[PDB]
Amino acid sequence: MEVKIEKPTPEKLKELSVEKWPIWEKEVSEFDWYYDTNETCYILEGKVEVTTEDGKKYVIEKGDLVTFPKGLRCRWKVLEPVRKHYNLF
d(CA 78, CA 88): 21
What single-letter DSSP state applies at residue 1?
-
Mention every residue, 6+ apart, whose C-beta is less than 8 A from residue 5: 58, 59, 60, 64, 66
The boundaries of the domain holding residue 24 are 1-89
**Residues 52-79, buried b or exposed e (16+ Cβ, 10 A)?**
beeeeebebbebbbbbbeeebebebebe
Task: Find all residues with CB under 8 Å of 53, minimum gap 6, and list them.
Answer: 73, 74
Evaluate whether 27 touches 78 at the Cβ level (below 8 Å). Answer: yes
DSSP three-state, residue 68: coil
* 8 A C-beta contact, residue 84 and residue 24: yes
Parallel/antiparallel/unpaired status of strands 39-52 and 65-67: antiparallel
CA distance 89 to 82: 22
**Which CATH number belongs to the domain containing residue 81 in this structure?**
2.60.120.10
Task: Work out the burial of residue 29: count CB atoms within 10 Å of its CB; fewer than 13 is exposed, 13-18 middle, 19 or more buried.
Answer: exposed
Number of domains in the chain: 1
